[PDB]
Write a protein that holds these residues in place. Structure first.
Motif, PDB file in Angstrom:
ATOM      1  N   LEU B   7       0.823  -1.206   0.000  1.00 54.98           N
ATOM      2  CA  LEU B   7       0.000   0.000   0.000  1.00 54.98           C
ATOM      3  C   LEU B   7       0.859   1.258   0.000  1.00 54.98           C
ATOM      4  O   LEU B   7       0.468   2.286  -0.565  1.00 54.98           O
ATOM      5  N   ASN B   8       2.034   1.200   0.634  1.00 51.79           N
ATOM      6  CA  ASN B   8       2.902   2.371   0.698  1.00 51.79           C
ATOM      7  C   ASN B   8       3.404   2.766  -0.685  1.00 51.79           C
ATOM      8  O   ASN B   8       3.603   3.955  -0.962  1.00 51.79           O
ATOM      9  N   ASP B   9       3.613   1.787  -1.567  1.00 53.94           N
ATOM     10  CA  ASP B   9       4.082   2.091  -2.914  1.00 53.94           C
ATOM     11  C   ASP B   9       2.989   2.739  -3.755  1.00 53.94           C
ATOM     12  O   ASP B   9       3.287   3.570  -4.621  1.00 53.94           O
ATOM     13  N   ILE B  10       1.728   2.375  -3.519  1.00 56.90           N
ATOM     14  CA  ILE B  10       0.629   2.928  -4.307  1.00 56.90           C
ATOM     15  C   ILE B  10       0.465   4.415  -4.018  1.00 56.90           C
ATOM     16  O   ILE B  10       0.399   5.240  -4.938  1.00 56.90           O
ATOM     17  N   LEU B  11       0.390   4.777  -2.735  1.00 62.14           N
ATOM     18  CA  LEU B  11       0.162   6.170  -2.363  1.00 62.14           C
ATOM     19  C   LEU B  11       1.331   7.054  -2.781  1.00 62.14           C
ATOM     20  O   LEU B  11       1.132   8.193  -3.220  1.00 62.14           O
ATOM     21  N   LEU B  26      -7.359  -4.177  -3.811  1.00 62.33           N
ATOM     22  CA  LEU B  26      -6.820  -5.021  -2.750  1.00 62.33           C
ATOM     23  C   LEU B  26      -7.862  -5.276  -1.669  1.00 62.33           C
ATOM     24  O   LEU B  26      -7.954  -6.388  -1.136  1.00 62.33           O
ATOM     25  N   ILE B  27      -8.658  -4.260  -1.334  1.00 67.60           N
ATOM     26  CA  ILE B  27      -9.664  -4.413  -0.286  1.00 67.60           C
ATOM     27  C   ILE B  27     -10.737  -5.401  -0.723  1.00 67.60           C
ATOM     28  O   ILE B  27     -11.323  -6.111   0.104  1.00 67.60           O
ATOM     29  N   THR B  28     -11.013  -5.464  -2.027  1.00 71.03           N
ATOM     30  CA  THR B  28     -12.011  -6.403  -2.529  1.00 71.03           C
ATOM     31  C   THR B  28     -11.498  -7.836  -2.454  1.00 71.03           C
ATOM     32  O   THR B  28     -12.189  -8.731  -1.953  1.00 71.03           O
ATOM     33  N   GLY B  29     -10.280  -8.073  -2.945  1.00 65.87           N
ATOM     34  CA  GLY B  29      -9.756  -9.430  -2.976  1.00 65.87           C
ATOM     35  C   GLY B  29      -9.359  -9.936  -1.603  1.00 65.87           C
ATOM     36  O   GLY B  29      -9.657 -11.076  -1.238  1.00 65.87           O
ATOM     37  N   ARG B  30      -8.667  -9.098  -0.825  1.00 65.56           N
ATOM     38  CA  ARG B  30      -8.238  -9.507   0.509  1.00 65.56           C
ATOM     39  C   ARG B  30      -9.427  -9.787   1.420  1.00 65.56           C
ATOM     40  O   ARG B  30      -9.335 -10.637   2.313  1.00 65.56           O
ATOM     41  N   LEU B  31     -10.545  -9.090   1.211  1.00 67.74           N
ATOM     42  CA  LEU B  31     -11.741  -9.354   2.004  1.00 67.74           C
ATOM     43  C   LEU B  31     -12.349 -10.703   1.643  1.00 67.74           C
ATOM     44  O   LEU B  31     -12.754 -11.466   2.528  1.00 67.74           O
ATOM     45  N   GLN B  32     -12.425 -11.014   0.346  1.00 68.45           N
ATOM     46  CA  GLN B  32     -12.963 -12.303  -0.078  1.00 68.45           C
ATOM     47  C   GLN B  32     -12.102 -13.454   0.429  1.00 68.45           C
ATOM     48  O   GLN B  32     -12.607 -14.554   0.679  1.00 68.45           O
TER      49      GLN B  32
ATOM     50  N   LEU C  12      11.149   2.679  -0.709  1.00 63.69           N
ATOM     51  CA  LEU C  12      10.276   1.742  -0.010  1.00 63.69           C
ATOM     52  C   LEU C  12      10.152   2.190   1.441  1.00 63.69           C
ATOM     53  O   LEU C  12      11.096   2.043   2.225  1.00 63.69           O
ATOM     54  N   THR C  13       8.988   2.727   1.796  1.00 64.03           N
ATOM     55  CA  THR C  13       8.729   3.259   3.126  1.00 64.03           C
ATOM     56  C   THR C  13       7.814   2.320   3.902  1.00 64.03           C
ATOM     57  O   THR C  13       6.967   1.631   3.327  1.00 64.03           O
ATOM     58  N   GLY C  14       7.996   2.301   5.218  1.00 67.45           N
ATOM     59  CA  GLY C  14       7.195   1.447   6.075  1.00 67.45           C
ATOM     60  C   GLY C  14       7.574   1.653   7.524  1.00 67.45           C
ATOM     61  O   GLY C  14       8.451   2.459   7.855  1.00 67.45           O
TER      62      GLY C  14
END
Lengths: 48, 49, 48, 28
Positions: B7-11, B26-32, C12-14
């Motif tokens: 998620l950090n790479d997307i934002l 991701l929220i759709t697939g990870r929830l299923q 790569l941040t975290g």
């Protein structure tokens, strides 16, 4: 790369390497020198 | 279906309206994946019971 | 190191606790992964 | 009848202990 004297042709186009150097792409959007700028694989604000 | 699983790479890569699309995938697939897990554990709990 | 921090290596941040690793990575490897395919170890780019 | 446990808990997969431990089971 951008301000060279003459670029190549689209028929026979050349490639240049940019590596091991500092590149600040913020100028390409803030400076009113170039016509149009739009990124697709990355946001234009997160280039740096 | 997202551009990346982190998620950090997307934002830090996509625009604000474009990042919400990639994160929503991701929220759709990870929830299923959870809905499949809780379904198996619930049925498995009835079997072991 | 030895404290929970917000790191950023190669963009790569975290969140996580940084500490000196006992793992011997080969000269080419940069990042590692855990059982969950998430980042387990890192390589500092400036001072390897 | 038979870290891994730490990696699961980091991912939100919490393994709670049973209420009736093995020692409590043995005495029943």
């Amino acid at each position: 790369v951008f301000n060279a004297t003459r670029f190549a042709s689209v028929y026979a186009w050349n490639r240049k390497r940019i590596s091991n150097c500092v590149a600040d792409y913020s100028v390409l959007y803030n400076s009113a020198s170039f016509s149009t700028f739009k990124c697709y694989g990355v946001s234009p604000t997160k280039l740096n | 279906g997202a551009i990346s699983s982190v998620l950090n790479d997307i934002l830090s890569r996509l625009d604000p309206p474009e990042a919400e699309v990639q994160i929503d995938r991701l929220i759709t697939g990870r929830l299923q994946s959870l809905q499949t897990y809780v379904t198996q554990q619930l049925i498995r709990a009835a079997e072991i019971r | 190191k030895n404290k929970c921090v917000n790191f950023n290596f190669n963009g790569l941040t975290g969140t996580g606790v940084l500490t000196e690793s006992n793992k011997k990575f080969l000269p080419f490897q940069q990042f590692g992964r855990d059982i969950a395919d998430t980042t387990d170890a890192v390589r500092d780019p400036q001072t390897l | 009848v038979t870290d891994l446990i730490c990696a699961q808990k980091f991912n939100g997969l919490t393994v709670l202990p049973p209420l009736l431990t093995d020692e409590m089971i043995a005495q029943y």
